[PDB]
Coordinates of N, CA, C and O in Angstrom, one line a residue:
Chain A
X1 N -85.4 -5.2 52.2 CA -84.5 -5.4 53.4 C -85.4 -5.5 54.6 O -86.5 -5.0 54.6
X2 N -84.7 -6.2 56.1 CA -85.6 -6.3 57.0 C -85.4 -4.6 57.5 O -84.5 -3.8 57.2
X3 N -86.7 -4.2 58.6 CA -87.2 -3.5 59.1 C -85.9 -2.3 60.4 O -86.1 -1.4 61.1
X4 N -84.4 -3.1 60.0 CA -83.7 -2.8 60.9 C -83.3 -1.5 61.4 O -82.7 -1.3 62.4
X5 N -83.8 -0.3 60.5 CA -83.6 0.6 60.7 C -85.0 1.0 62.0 O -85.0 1.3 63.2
X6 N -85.9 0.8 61.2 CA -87.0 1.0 62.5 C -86.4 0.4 64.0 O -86.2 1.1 65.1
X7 N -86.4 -0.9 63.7 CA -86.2 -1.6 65.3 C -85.2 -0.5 66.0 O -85.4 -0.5 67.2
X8 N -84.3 0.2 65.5 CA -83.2 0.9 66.3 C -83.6 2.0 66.7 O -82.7 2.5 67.4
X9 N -84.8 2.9 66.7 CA -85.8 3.6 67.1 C -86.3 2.9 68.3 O -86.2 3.2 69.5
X10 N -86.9 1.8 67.7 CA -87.7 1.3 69.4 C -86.9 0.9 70.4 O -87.3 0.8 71.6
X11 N -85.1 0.6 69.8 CA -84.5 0.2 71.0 C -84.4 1.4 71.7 O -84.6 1.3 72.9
X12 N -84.1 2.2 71.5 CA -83.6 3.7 72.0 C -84.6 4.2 73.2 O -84.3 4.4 74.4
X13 N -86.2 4.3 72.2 CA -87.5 4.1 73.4 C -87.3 3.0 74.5 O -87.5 3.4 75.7
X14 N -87.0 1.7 74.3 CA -86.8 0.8 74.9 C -85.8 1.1 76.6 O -86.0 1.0 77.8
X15 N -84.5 1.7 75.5 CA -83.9 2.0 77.0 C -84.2 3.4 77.5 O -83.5 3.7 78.5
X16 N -85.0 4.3 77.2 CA -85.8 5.3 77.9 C -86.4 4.8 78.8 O -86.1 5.1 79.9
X17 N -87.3 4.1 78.6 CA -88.1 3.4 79.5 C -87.8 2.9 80.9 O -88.3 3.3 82.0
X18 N -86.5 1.9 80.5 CA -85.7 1.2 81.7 C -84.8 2.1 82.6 O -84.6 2.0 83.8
X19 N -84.4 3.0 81.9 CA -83.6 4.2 82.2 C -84.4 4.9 83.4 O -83.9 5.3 84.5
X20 N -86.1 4.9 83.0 CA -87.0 6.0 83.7 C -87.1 5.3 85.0 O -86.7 5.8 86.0
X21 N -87.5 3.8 85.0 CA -87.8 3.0 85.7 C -86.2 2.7 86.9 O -86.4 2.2 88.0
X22 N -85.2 2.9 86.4 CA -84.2 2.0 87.0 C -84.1 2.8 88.3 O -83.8 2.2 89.3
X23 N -84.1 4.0 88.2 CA -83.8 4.4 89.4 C -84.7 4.1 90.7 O -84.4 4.5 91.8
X24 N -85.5 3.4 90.5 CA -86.6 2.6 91.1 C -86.1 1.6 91.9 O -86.4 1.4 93.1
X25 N -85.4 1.0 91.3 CA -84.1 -0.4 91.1 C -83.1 0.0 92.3 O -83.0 -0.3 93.4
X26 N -82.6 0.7 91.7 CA -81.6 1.6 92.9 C -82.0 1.7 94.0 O -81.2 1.3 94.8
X27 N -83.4 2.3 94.4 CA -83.8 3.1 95.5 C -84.0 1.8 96.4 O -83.6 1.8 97.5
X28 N -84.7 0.6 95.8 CA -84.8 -0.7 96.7 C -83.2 -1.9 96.8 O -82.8 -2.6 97.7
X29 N -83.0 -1.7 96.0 CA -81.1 -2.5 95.7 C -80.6 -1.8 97.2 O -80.3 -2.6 98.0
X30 N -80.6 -0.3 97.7 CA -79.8 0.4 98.7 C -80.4 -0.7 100.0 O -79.7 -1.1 100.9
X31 N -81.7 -0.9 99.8 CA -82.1 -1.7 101.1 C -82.2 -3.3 101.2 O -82.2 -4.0 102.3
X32 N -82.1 -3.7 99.9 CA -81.8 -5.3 99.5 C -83.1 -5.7 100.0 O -82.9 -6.7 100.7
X33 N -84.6 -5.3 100.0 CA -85.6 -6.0 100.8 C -86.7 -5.4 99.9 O -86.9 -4.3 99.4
X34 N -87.4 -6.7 99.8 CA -88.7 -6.4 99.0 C -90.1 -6.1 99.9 O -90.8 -7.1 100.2
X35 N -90.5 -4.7 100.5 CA -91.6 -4.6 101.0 C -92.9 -5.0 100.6 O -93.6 -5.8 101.2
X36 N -93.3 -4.3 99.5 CA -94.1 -4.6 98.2 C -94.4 -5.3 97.9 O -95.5 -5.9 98.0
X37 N -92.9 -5.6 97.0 CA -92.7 -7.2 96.3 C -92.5 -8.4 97.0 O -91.7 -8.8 97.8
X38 N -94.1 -9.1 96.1 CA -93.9 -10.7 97.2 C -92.9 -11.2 96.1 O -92.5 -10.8 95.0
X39 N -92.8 -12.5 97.0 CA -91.5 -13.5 96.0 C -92.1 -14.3 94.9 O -91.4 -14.9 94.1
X40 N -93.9 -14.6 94.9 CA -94.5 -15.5 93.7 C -94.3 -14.1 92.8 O -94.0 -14.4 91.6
X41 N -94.3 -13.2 93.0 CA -94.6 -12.2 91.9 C -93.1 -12.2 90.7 O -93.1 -11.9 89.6
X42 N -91.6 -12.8 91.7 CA -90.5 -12.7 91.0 C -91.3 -13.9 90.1 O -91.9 -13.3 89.3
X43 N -91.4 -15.5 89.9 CA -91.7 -16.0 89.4 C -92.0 -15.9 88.4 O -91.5 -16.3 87.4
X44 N -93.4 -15.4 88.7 CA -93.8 -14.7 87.3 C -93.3 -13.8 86.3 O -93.3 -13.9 85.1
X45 N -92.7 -12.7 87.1 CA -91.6 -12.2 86.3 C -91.0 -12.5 85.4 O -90.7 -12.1 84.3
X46 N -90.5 -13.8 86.1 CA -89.4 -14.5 85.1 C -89.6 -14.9 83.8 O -88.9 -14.6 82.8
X47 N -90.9 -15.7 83.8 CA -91.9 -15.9 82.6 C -92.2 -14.4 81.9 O -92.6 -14.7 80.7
X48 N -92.3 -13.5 82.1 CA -92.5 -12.2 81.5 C -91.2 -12.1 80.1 O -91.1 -11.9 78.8
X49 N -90.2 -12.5 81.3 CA -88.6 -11.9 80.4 C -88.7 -13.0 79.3 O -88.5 -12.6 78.2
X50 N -89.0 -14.3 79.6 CA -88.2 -15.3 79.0 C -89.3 -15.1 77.6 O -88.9 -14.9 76.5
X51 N -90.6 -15.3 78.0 CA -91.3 -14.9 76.9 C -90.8 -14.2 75.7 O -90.6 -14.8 74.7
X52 N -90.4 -12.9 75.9 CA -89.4 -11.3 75.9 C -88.3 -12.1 74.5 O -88.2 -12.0 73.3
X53 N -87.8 -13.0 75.7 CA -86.6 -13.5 74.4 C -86.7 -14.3 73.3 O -85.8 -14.2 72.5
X54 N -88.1 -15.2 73.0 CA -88.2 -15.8 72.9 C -88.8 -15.3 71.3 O -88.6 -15.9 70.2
X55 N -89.6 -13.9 71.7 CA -90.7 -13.5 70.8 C -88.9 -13.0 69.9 O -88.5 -13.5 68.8
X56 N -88.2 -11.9 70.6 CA -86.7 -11.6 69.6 C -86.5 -12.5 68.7 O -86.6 -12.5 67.5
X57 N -86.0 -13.5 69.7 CA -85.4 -14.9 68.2 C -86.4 -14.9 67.3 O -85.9 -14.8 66.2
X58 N -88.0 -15.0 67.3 CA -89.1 -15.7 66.5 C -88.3 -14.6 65.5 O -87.5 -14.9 64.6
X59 N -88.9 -13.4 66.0 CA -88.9 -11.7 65.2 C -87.4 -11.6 64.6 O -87.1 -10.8 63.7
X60 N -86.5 -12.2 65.0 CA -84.9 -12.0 64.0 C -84.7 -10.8 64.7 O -84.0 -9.9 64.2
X61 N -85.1 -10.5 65.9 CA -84.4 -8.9 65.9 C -83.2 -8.7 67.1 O -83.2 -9.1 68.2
X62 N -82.4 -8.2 66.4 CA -81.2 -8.4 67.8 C -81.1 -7.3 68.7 O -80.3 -7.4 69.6
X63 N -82.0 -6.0 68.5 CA -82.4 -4.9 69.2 C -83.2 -5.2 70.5 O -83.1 -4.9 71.7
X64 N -84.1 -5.9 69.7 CA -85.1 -6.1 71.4 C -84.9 -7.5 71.8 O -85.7 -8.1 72.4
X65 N -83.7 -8.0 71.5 CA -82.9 -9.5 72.0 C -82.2 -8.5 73.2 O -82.6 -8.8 74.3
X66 N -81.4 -7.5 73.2 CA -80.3 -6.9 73.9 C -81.0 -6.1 74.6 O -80.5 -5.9 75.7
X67 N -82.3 -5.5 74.4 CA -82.8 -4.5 75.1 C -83.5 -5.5 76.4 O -83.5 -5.2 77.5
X68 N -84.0 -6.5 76.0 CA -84.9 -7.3 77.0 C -83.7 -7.5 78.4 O -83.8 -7.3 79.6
X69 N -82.7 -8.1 77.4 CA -81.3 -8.7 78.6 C -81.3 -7.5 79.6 O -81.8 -7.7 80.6
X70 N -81.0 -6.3 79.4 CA -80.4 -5.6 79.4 C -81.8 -4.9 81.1 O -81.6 -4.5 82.2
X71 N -82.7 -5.0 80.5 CA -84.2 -4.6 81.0 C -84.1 -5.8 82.5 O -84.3 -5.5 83.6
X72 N -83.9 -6.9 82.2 CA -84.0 -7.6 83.1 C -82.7 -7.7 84.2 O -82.7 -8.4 85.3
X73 N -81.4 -6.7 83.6 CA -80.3 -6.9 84.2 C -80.7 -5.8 85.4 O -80.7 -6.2 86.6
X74 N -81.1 -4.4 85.3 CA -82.0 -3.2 85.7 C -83.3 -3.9 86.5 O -83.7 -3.3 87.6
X75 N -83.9 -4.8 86.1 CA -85.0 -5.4 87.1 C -84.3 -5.8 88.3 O -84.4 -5.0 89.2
X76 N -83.6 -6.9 88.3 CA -82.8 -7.3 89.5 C -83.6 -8.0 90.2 O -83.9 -9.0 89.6
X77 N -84.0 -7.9 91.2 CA -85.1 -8.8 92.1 C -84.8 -9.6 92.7 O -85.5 -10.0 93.7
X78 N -83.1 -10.4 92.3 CA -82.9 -11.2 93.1 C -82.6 -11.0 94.4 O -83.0 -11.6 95.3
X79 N -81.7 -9.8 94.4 CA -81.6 -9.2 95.7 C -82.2 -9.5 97.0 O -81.9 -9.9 98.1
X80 N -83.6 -9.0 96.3 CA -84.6 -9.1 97.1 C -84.9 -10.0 98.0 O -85.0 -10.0 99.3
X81 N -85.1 -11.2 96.7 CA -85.5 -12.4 96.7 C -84.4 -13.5 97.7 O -84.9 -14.6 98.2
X82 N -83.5 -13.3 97.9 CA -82.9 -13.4 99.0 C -82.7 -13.3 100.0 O -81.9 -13.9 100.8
X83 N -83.9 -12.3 100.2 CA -84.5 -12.0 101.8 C -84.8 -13.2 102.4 O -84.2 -13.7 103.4
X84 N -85.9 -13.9 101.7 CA -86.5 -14.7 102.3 C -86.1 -16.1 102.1 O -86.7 -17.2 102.4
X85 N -84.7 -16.0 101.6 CA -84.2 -17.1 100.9 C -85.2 -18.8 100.5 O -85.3 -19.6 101.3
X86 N -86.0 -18.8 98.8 CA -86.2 -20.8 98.6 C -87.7 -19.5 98.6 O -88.9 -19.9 98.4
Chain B
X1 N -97.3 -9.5 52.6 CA -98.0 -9.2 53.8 C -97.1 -8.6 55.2 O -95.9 -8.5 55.5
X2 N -98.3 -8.3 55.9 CA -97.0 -7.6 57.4 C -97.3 -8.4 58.0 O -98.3 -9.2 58.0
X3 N -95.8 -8.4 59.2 CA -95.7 -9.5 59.5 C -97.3 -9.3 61.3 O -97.0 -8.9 62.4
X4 N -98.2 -9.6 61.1 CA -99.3 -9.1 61.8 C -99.4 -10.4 62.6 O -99.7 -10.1 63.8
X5 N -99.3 -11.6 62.3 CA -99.2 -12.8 63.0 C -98.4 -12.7 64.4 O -98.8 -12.9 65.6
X6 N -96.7 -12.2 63.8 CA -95.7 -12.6 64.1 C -96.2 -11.4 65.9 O -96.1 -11.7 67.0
X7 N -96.7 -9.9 65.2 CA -97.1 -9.2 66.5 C -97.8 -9.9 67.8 O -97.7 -9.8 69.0
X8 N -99.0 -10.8 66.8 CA -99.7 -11.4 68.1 C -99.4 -11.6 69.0 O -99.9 -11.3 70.1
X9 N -98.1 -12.5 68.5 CA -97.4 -13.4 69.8 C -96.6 -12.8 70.5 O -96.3 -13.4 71.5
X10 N -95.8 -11.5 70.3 CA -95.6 -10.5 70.9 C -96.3 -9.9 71.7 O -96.0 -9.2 72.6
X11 N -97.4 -10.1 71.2 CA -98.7 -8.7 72.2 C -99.1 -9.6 73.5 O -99.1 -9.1 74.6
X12 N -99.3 -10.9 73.1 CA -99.5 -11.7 74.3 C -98.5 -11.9 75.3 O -98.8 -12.1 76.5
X13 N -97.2 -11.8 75.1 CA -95.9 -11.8 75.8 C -96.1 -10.7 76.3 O -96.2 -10.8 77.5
X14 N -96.1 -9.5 75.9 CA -95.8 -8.0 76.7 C -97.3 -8.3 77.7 O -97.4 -8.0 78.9
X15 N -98.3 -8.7 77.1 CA -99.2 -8.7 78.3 C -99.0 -9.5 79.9 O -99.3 -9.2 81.1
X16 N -98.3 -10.8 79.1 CA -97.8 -12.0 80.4 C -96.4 -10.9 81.4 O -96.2 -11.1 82.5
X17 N -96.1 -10.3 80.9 CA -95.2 -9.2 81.8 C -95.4 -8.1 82.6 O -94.7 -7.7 83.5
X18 N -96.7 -7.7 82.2 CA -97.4 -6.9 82.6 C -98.7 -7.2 83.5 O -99.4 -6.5 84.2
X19 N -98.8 -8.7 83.3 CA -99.6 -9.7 84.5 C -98.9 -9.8 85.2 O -99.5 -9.5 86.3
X20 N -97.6 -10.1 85.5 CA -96.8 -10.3 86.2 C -96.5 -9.4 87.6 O -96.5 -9.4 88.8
X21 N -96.3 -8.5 86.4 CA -95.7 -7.1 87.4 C -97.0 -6.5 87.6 O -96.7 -5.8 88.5
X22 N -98.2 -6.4 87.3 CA -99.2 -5.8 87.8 C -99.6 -6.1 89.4 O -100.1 -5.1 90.0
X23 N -99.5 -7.1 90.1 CA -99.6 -7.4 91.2 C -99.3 -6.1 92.1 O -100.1 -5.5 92.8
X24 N -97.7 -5.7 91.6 CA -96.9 -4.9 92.7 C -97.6 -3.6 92.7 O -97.8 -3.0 93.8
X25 N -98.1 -2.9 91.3 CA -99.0 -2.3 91.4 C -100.0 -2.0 92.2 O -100.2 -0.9 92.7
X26 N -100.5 -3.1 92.3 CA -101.8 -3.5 93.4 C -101.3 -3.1 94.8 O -101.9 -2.3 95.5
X27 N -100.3 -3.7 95.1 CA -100.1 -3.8 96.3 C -99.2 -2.4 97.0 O -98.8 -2.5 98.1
X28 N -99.1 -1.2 96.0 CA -98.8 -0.2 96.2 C -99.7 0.7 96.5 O -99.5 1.7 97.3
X29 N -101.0 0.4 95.7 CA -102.0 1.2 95.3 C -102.8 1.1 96.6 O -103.6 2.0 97.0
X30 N -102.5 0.0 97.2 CA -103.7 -0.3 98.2 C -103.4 0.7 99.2 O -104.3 1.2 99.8
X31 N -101.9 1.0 99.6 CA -101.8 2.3 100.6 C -101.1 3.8 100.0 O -100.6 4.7 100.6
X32 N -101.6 3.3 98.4 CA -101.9 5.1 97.5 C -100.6 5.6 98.0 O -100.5 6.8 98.2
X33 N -99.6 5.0 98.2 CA -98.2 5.8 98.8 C -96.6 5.7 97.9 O -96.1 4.6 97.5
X34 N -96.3 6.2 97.9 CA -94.9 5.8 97.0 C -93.9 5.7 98.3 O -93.9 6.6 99.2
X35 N -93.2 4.7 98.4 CA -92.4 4.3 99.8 C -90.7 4.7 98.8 O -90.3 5.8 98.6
X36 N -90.3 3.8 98.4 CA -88.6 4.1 97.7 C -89.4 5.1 95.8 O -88.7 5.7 95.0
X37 N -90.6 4.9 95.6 CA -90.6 5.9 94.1 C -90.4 7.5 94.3 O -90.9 8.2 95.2
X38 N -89.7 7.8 93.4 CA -89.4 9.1 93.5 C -90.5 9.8 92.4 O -90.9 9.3 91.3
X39 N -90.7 11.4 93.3 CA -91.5 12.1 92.6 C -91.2 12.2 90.5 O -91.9 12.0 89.6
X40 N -89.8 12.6 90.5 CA -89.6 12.9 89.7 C -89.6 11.7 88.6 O -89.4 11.8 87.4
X41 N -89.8 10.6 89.2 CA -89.5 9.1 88.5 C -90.7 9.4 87.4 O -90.4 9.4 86.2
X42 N -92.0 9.7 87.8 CA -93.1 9.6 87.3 C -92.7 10.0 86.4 O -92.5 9.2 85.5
X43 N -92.3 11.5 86.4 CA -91.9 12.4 84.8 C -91.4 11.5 84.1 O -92.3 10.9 83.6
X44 N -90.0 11.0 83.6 CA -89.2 10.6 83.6 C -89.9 9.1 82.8 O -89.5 8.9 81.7
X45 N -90.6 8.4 83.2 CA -92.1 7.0 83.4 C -92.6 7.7 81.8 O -92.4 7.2 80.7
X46 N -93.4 9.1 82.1 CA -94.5 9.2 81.2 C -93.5 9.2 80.3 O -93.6 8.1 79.7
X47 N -92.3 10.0 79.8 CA -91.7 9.9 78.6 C -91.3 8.7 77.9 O -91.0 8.9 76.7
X48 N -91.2 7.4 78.3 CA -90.9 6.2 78.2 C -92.2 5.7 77.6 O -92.2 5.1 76.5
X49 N -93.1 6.0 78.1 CA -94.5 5.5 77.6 C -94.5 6.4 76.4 O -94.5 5.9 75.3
X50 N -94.5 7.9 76.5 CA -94.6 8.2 75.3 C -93.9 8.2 74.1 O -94.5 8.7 73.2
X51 N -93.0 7.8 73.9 CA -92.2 7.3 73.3 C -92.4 5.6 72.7 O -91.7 5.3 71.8
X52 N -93.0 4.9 73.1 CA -93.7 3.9 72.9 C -95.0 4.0 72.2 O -95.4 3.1 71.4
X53 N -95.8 5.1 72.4 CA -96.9 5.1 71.5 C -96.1 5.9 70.2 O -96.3 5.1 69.2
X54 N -95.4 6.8 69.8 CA -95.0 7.5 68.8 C -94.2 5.9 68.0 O -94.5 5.6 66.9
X55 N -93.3 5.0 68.8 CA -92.9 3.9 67.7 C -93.9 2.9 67.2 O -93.7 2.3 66.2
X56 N -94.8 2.7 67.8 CA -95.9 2.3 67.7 C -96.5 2.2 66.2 O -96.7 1.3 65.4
X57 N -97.0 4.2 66.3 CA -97.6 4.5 65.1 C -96.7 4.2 64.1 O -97.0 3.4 63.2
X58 N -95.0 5.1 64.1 CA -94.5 4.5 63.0 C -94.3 3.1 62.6 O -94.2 3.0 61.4
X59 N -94.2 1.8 63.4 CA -93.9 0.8 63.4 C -95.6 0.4 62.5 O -95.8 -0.7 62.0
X60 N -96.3 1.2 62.6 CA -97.6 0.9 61.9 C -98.6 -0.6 62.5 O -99.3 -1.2 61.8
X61 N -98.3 -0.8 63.9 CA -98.4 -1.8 64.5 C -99.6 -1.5 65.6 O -99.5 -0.5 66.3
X62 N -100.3 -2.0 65.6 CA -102.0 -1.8 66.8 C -101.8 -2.8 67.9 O -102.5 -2.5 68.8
X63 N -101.2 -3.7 67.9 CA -101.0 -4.8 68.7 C -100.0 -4.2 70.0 O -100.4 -4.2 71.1
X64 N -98.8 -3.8 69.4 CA -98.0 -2.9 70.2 C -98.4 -1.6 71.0 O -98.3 -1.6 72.3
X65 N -98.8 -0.7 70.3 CA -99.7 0.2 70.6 C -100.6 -0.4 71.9 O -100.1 -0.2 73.0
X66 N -101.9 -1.2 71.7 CA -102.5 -1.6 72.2 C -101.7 -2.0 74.0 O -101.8 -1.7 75.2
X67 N -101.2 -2.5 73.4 CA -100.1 -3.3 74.8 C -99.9 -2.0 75.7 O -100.5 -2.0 76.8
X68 N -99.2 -1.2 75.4 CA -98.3 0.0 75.5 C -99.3 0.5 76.6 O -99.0 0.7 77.8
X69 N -100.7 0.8 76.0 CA -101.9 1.5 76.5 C -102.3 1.1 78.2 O -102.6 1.7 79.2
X70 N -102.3 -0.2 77.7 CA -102.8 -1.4 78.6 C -101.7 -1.2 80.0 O -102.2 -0.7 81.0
X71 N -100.4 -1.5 79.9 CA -99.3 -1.4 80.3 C -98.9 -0.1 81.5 O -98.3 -0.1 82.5
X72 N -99.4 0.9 80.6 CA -99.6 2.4 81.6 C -100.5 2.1 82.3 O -100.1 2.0 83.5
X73 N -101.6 1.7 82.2 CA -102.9 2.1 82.9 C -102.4 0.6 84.2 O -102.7 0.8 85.4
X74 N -102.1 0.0 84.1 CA -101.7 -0.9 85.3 C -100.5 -0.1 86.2 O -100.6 0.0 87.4
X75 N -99.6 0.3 85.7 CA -98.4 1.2 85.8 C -99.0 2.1 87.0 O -98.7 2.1 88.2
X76 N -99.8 2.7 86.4 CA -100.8 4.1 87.5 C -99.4 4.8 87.9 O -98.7 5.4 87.1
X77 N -99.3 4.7 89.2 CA -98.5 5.8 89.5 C -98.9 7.3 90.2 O -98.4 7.9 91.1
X78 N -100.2 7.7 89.3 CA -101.0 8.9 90.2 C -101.2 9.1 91.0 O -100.8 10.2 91.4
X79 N -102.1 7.9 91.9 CA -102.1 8.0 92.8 C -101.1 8.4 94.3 O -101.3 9.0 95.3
X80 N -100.0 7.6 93.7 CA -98.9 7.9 94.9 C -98.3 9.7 94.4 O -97.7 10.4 95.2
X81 N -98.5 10.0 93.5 CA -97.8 11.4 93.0 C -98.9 12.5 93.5 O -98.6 13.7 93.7
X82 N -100.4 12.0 93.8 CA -101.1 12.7 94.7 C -100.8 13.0 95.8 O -101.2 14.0 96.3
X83 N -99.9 12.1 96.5 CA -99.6 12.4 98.0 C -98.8 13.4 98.0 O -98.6 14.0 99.1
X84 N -98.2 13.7 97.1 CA -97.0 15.1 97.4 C -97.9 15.8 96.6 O -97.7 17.0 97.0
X85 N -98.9 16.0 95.7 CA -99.5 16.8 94.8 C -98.2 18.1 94.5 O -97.5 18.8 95.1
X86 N -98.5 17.9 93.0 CA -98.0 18.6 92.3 C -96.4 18.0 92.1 O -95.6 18.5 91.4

């Protein structure tokens, strides 16, 4: 059988992770403005996630299919990215 | 056989994510300061990571692993948790 019981272990780590990180999310979402964050960096980002999805479908796994979505819903950025609007 | 191919292309993806986002890193690090991160974020960070090396080993995967390693050490974070020390 496939590996499915494992993958449900890594999703769990998976949303630990985002969980640790999101409140991060939060703390810049309150101000809607990316100090830090320039806007080529969203870009690339994006290429990060989509990669992300891509490797799921290869891999058959629908854990780190939901966990990636889910990772990138918690990233956000657009917000941001609206500062500077283009 | 394991599927060890199929990690590669995974390992290069979590890197293109962590190229990505490594920037912001950078540009945190340069004034050593946490502006919106919270002290306690960090805590909360390492368990996510650790939790990633333990699926790792069971997942019996080096590629992953590897990533994970890589991924922290861009992440940093110390330095801004020095400014409040402790």
């Amino acid at each position: 059988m496939d590996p499915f019981l494992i993958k449900l272990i890594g999703f769990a780590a998976a949303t630990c992770t985002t969980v640790a990180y999101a409140p991060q999310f939060i703390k810049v979402l309150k101000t809607r403005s990316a100090r830090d964050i320039s806007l080529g960096m969203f870009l690339v980002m994006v290429l990060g996630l989509a990669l992300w999805l891509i490797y799921g479908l290869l891999s058959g796994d629908a854990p780190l299919i939901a966990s990636n979505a889910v990772t990138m819903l918690l990233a956000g950025g657009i917000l941001v990215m609206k500062l500077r609007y283009g």
